[PDB]
Design an enzyme around this catalytic site. Structure first.
Site, PDB file in Angstrom:
ATOM      1  N   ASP A  35       0.752  -1.122  -0.020  1.00 50.68           N
ATOM      2  CA  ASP A  35       0.072   0.028   0.033  1.00 50.68           C
ATOM      3  C   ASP A  35       0.920   1.465   0.049  1.00 50.68           C
ATOM      4  OD1 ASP A  35      -2.007   1.895   0.185  1.00 50.68           O
ATOM      5  OD2 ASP A  35      -2.480   1.289   2.290  1.00 50.68           O
ATOM      6  N   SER A 199      -0.813  15.679 -11.997  1.00 55.57           N
ATOM      7  CA  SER A 199      -0.645  15.154 -13.402  1.00 55.57           C
ATOM      8  C   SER A 199      -1.036  16.501 -14.418  1.00 55.57           C
ATOM      9  CB  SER A 199      -2.120  14.269 -13.522  1.00 55.57           C
ATOM     10  OG  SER A 199      -2.369  14.120 -15.076  1.00 55.57           O
TER      11      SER A 199
HETATM   12  O1  LIG Z   1      -9.101   2.443   1.955  1.00 58.68           O
HETATM   13  C1  LIG Z   1      -8.346   2.778   1.028  1.00 58.68           C
HETATM   14  N1  LIG Z   1      -8.958   3.222  -0.160  1.00 58.68           N
HETATM   15  C2  LIG Z   1      -9.810   3.885  -0.662  1.00 58.68           C
HETATM   16  C3  LIG Z   1     -11.067   3.022  -0.561  1.00 58.68           C
HETATM   17  C4  LIG Z   1     -12.069   4.251  -0.808  1.00 58.68           C
HETATM   18  C5  LIG Z   1     -12.051   5.199  -1.015  1.00 58.68           C
HETATM   19 CL1  LIG Z   1     -13.365   6.351  -1.386  1.00 58.68          CL
HETATM   20  C6  LIG Z   1     -10.646   5.990  -0.966  1.00 58.68           C
HETATM   21  N2  LIG Z   1      -9.666   5.267  -0.709  1.00 58.68           N
HETATM   22  C7  LIG Z   1      -7.096   1.974   1.105  1.00 58.68           C
HETATM   23  O2  LIG Z   1      -6.248   2.252   0.569  1.00 58.68           O
HETATM   24  N3  LIG Z   1      -7.141   0.791   1.839  1.00 58.68           N
HETATM   25  C8  LIG Z   1      -6.008  -0.240   1.800  1.00 58.68           C
HETATM   26  C9  LIG Z   1      -6.439  -1.514   2.584  1.00 58.68           C
HETATM   27  C10 LIG Z   1      -7.818  -1.652   2.537  1.00 58.68           C
HETATM   28  C11 LIG Z   1      -8.177  -0.006   2.427  1.00 58.68           C
END
Ligand SMILES: O=C(Nc1ccc(Cl)cn1)C(=O)N1CCCC1
Length: 330
Positions: A35, A199
């Site tokens: 991550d 970007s």
């Molecule tokens: O929560 C995360 N991303 C994410 C998911 C939805 C939204 Cl709107 C924004 N970001 C994420 O990076 N992880 C890593 C482990 C599982 C969750």
């Protein structure tokens, strides 16, 4: 030194990718979600509340002869999707694809939220953002990459994620056979602890390129591409029958529709996300409505170049004194 590990989608939609990681002595192999949007290496463990473990492989520090309690240390983290986990901390030997770090902080979960329990394929996270985001208290801990950096042939790692297929994380070297053309490097701000960059714009399908600055983060731990509502509206307006559904929580489309590609700018270079990469399948089994892979970042507070974008590229996370990001087509 270097390391090289294969990363594999957890399911048919590429919802996430898991990479095997060896922890402890003898090795305990766990499949972790690498991550670049966070900075904690945490694992399901023998300490995790029993009711919150459902099929995951656990780390048992008492079976590792190199494990040492980091006395008094605790950790607690929340993610953008509302998930969370917390616990205590050991130091142990951690190897990724032949690259070994001794004394790595391995954060042992005592509690995990339901989304983690419910995903049997992910045994924990390995954070690759900047160590300033690490949640261990009272003494913040370093990421695996930060610990390895000085030993690496070159202070870099690369992400080469596959579309509906395995890919590769490399540490310490750039595989010049893994991409086409040249790598375009772009400036990074570490002020929020992320691999944050700007970007230079976008295009939808065969449309003309719109030059506009889009500040966002390169985040391997986020599935989708989250961009400003203007950009996302312009994309889905080119998809017959597409609409934003508040009940579903984003843009959906009939999969009888053909998805255009989406291009994003890296300096003067261009990365093309093929339309197929933007299809995340039926919203529920048997539904004719499909979930879109490009969604609005409104209310996240940051744009996120997640897997949908990154898997279209060979991506260099350059951890030189002044970090930068590189993107190549592949
Ligand atoms: O929560 C995360 N991303 C994410 C998911 C939805 C939204 Cl709107 C924004 N970001 C994420 O990076 N992880 C890593 C482990 C599982 C969750």
């Amino acid at each position: 030194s270097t390391g090289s590990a294969t990363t594999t989608p957890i399911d048919s939609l590429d919802d996430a990718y898991i990479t095997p990681v060896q922890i402890g002595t003898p090795a305990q192999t766990l499949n972790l979600d690498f991550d670049t949007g966070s900075s904690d290496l945490w694992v399901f463990s023998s300490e995790t509340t029993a009711s919150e473990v459902d099929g995951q492989t656990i780390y048992t520090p008492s079976k590792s002869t190199t494990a040492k309690l980091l006395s008094g240390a605790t950790w607690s983290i929340s993610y953008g999707d509302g998930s969370s986990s917390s616990g205590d901390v050991y130091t142990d030997t951690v190897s990724v694809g032949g690259l070994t770090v001794t004394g790595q902080a391995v954060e042992s979960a005592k509690k995990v939220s339901s989304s983690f329990t419910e995903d049997s394929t992910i045994d924990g996270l390995l954070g690759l953002a900047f160590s300033t985001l690490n949640t261990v208290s009272p003494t913040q801990q370093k990421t695996f990459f930060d610990n390895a950096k000085a030993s690496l042939d070159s202070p870099v790692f690369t992400a080469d994620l596959g579309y509906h297929a395995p890919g590769t994380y490399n540490f310490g070297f750039i595989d010049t056979t893994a991409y086409t053309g040249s790598i375009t490097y772009t400036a990074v701000s570490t002020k929020q602890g992320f691999w944050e960059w700007t970007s230079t714009g976008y295009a939808v399908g065969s449309g003309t390129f719109k030059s506009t600055s889009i500040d966002g983060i390169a985040d391997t731990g986020t599935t989708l591409l989250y961009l400003p509502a203007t950009v996302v509206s312009a994309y889905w307006a080119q998809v017959s029958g597409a609409k934003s559904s508040s009940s579903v929580g984003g843009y959906v489309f009939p999969c009888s529709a053909t998805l255009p590609s989406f291009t994003f700018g890296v300096g003067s270079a261009r990365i093309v996300i093929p339309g197929d990469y933007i299809d995340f399948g039926p919203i529920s089994t048997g539904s004719s409505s499909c979930f879109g892979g490009i969604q609005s970042s409104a209310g996240i507070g940051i744009n996120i170049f997640g897997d949908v974008a990154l898997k279209a590229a060979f991506v260099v996370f350059n951890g030189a004194t002044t970090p930068t990001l590189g993107f190549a087509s592949k």
